[PDB]
Design a protein around this nucleic acid. Structure first.
Lengths: 215, 5, 153, 240
RNA sequence: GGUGCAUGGUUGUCGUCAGCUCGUGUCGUGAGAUGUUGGGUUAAGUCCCGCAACGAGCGCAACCCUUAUCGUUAGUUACA
RNA sequence: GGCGAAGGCGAAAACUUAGGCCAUUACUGACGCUUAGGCUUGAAAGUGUGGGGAGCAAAUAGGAUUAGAUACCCUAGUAGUCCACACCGUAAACGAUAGAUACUAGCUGUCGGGGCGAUCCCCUCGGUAGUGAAGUUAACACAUUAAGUAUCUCGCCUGG
RNA sequence: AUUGGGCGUAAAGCAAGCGCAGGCGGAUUGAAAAGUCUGGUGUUAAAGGCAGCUGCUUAACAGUUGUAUGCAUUGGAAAC
């Protein structure tokens, strides 16, 4: 019905995640067709570390994966027993085309990033959690960080079949008249034996001064 | 309520 | 306090498109020491309505007498032709009343009373009939003072 | 003396043929003027009882509120008096939802104080629009609920010129068992109000001296110099 | 390959519309009403007035980019 | 606004009559009320007996037009419609609101008597409404003129 | 539906009136005590209601004891 929240304020007022440029229709086609897959496969299996995002920097046959993990201890493990297979699998998924040069750094305030929240909610959905209890736990976690208004919506069944109940949430400051609100939005499609469930999280990150232009 | 308490 | 829910009703409003439900829950809070309240809550989430009704009943507690866990006189309550029988009973005999009536009398900290639930017995009607049958109770000493002659009658 | 009959030469009659028969004990037989006249002796006794009662309760610093919402004259007098002495007063009408809950007043006064300190620390550094708007809401809210910011407890007694004229507020006082004094004219119920004061408001002298006497009672109850407690000087004021 | 009343998303849509609501209080014995209601004032539930309504969210106006006026760094392969 | 128990009722002149209120220090001193049944009255329309043909109008018919018509729009037109007598003995005959009895805040109305006195201002005694109190009905609302309170009386009602 | 119903809007007041028998009952005085309750006696069976006890190797079954309203007769009640 409406345009994506991350397709309106992102790209003209919000910092990008994938930042790369080179000659088009020659090699950047492979870049575009490969970076999305590697980013998705990072989240597919490595949910233990609860990484937030990886910034991709593809400029003249080099890539710099800016890894941000809330709990990089899973990646570190013991005597770096996990980074070896991580490096080897990124090498396999990237081939001999470009350098890897992965980095390790802790991300500040990952709670405001709904991507990890969407990942946890999808894990809960595929773990057969009560919906109300999951929503209450998400509310507890977000109020622990003291964030702004949060909207957690669900599309699909309610642990049943042939949906026949009502649901409607509008909570918290979500201003659209002002373009200085800085609200992010994440969506995740979790799978269960009865179908697919779409969890949507809108998170307001609060107003800050001198915004309206991308940093 | 004659007295105050 | 027991916080036992006594009723849950599926209600809704009609629009030109869909139908917006606001199903309600009615609960009673009673410590069995003489503080009784009833609260209703209309919401969209069952636990939310439950907690709202619980809090409303907690703030709506009203004091009642505790005299040997029984009324010292017979009385016939009535709330719109919905009459309730309140005939005092001996101790150690057993409670003979309706499920809502038994819940009300137990949460009130009372003993066995010969009752009967006739007339319109809608849950709210039952609550009204019971409260009318219990709000008119007095104190025998006070009733004695309210007359020229004192007899503790 | 207190509640003397010297000022009670124009003190009877407020309305005609709009009366409650349940108020007949506090009044004297009617005249051709059809004004509902008041007995000046039972009124004096009730005034003395109310005076000593409020003196006793406010000597222990009981919370007292003022509600005077007449057109211009009694309202202006209440404003001047309640501004002269540091007392609580609400000279405007009642929209409800305030007296019922202290929680409905705590947040209100917190926001009021926050806006006051913001305007004290703001010097049009933001745009003029926001500063002017904030000052406008401050003035608007303080014009009704702005005369009372010194209370930290529940009210204990209320003063109203006419309960039916402010029945909503009376309802807000009916939930609590606190007493209340009122200048009942002829059409009130002596069960929702504890203190019955048979008096009129069609004359300036009656209502003005009643309000001033109550104000002096409250002031002297707070260990303050006496102004009008036994003075025979009848101050002359006309409705204007 | 069927399965879009098993579905996620997606779309134009009433509509760029101002309606839709959260809590608290009052009243009803409940469906609920008071806001959401009336006079002004706007594209507008923007506000005022009266006002059992009170605070708050939602859409709104300001926060984005061209245009008019000027200043500024500012130069060709522009001015010449 | 009124009369009469409910129908129903207005140009006037007259004929006999009741009922209706008020006070009644005068009169019997219990003679009171209701009441199965029976009886009386009982709108409008219809039936039979002669005027009747002013109008209206049933039976209709014509035109119009309905994909539509024993109707709709208009016209020609029929017993009846009015008067006197027998057969209506019937209805939202409803105040959708049984009768009678006595009592129960208060404000604004109407008139007749009573007075003050010019009617006019006022109130008393009776018919007559509205606002509105308690109380009650689920509410509507009734609201001392109740759809209130209680008693007597019959009649009715127990899913359609 | 005599405890234990209503008859305006759910079905529930004949169209209304006279209206007999009959029903109800305005205060008080006298009597009968006619109705009423009480007091005495008797009538009220067997089984069986009620409770104590009894043989039922507790238990079904049955038996003892007193006991279930009510009626006749006799002395009253003045409240109805």
């Amino acid at each position: 019905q409406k345009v994506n929240s991350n397709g309106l304020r992102f790209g003209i007022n919000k910092n990008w995640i994938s930042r790369w440029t080179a000659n088009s229709h020659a090699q950047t086609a492979k870049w575009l067709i490969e970076d999305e897959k590697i980013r998705n496969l990072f989240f597919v299996n490595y949910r233990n570390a609860q990484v937030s995002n990886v910034e991709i920097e593809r400029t003249q046959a080099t890539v710099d994966v800016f890894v941000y993990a809330a709990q990089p201890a899973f990646l570190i493990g013991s005597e770096n027993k996990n980074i070896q297979k991580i490096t080897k699998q990124i090498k396999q998924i990237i081939g001999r085309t470009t350098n890897l040069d992965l980095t390790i750094n802790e991300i500040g305030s990952p709670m405001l990033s709904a991507r990890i929240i969407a990942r946890d909610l999808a894990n809960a959905i595929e773990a057969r959690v009560p919906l109300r209890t999951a929503m209450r736990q998400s509310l507890i976690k977000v109020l622990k960080a003291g964030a702004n208004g949060i909207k957690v919506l669900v599309s699909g069944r309610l642990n049943g079949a042939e949906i026949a109940r009502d649901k409607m949430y509008i909570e918290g400051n979500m201003p659209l008249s002002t373009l200085r609100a800085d609200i992010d939005y994440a969506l995740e499609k979790a799978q269960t034996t009865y179908g697919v469930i779409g969890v949507k999280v809108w998170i307001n990150r609060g107003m800050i001064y001198t915004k309206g232009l991308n940093r | 309520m004659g007295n105050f308490d | 306090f027991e916080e036992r829910i006594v009723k849950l009703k599926r209600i809704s409003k009609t629009t030109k498109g869909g139908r917006n439900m606001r199903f309600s829950v009615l609960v009673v809070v009673g410590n069995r020491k003489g503080k009784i309240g009833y609260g209703i809550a209309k919401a969209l989430e069952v636990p939310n309505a439950i907690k709202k009704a619980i809090k409303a009943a907690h703030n709506s507690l009203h004091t009642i007498e505790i005299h040997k866990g029984s009324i010292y006189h017979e009385v016939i309550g009535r709330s719109g032709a919905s009459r309730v029988l309140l005939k005092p009973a001996p101790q150690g005999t057993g409670i003979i009343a309706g499920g809502a009536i038994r819940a009300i009398i137990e949460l009130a900290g009372y003993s066995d009373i010969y009752t009967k639930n006739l007339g319109r017995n809608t849950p709210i009607n039952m609550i009204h009939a019971t409260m009318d049958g219990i709000l008119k109770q007095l104190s025998p000493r006070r009733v004695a003072i309210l007359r020229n002659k004192n007899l503790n009658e | 003396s207190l509640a003397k009959l010297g000022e009670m030469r124009t003190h009877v009659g407020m309305v005609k043929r709009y009366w409650n028969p349940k108020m007949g004990f506090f009044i004297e037989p009617e005249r051709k003027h059809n004004n509902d006249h008041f007995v000046l002796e039972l009124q004096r006794q009730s005034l003395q009882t109310a005076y000593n009662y409020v003196k006793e309760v406010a000597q222990n610093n009981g919370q007292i509120l003022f509600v005077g919402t007449k057109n211009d004259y009694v309202k202006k007098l209440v404003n001047n008096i309640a501004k002269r002495v540091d007392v609580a007063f609400i000279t405007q009408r009642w929209l409800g939802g305030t007296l019922t809950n202290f929680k409905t007043l705590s947040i209100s006064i917190n926001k009021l104080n926050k806006l006051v300190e913001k305007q004290a620390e703001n010097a049009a550094d933001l745009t003029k629009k926001e500063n002017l708007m904030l000052s406008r809401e401050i003035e608007r809210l303080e014009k009704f609920f702005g005369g009372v910011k010194s209370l930290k407890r529940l009210p204990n007694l209320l003063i109203v010129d006419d309960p039916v004229y402010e029945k909503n507020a009376v309802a807000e006082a009916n939930i609590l068992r606190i007493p209340v004094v009122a200048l009942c004219n002829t059409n009130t119920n002596p069960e929702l109000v504890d203190f019955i004061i048979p008096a009129n408001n069609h004359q300036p002298q009656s209502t003005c001296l009643l309000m001033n006497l109550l104000a002096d009672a409250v002031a002297e109850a707070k260990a303050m110099p006496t102004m009008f407690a036994y003075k025979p000087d009848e101050e002359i004021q006309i409705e204007i």
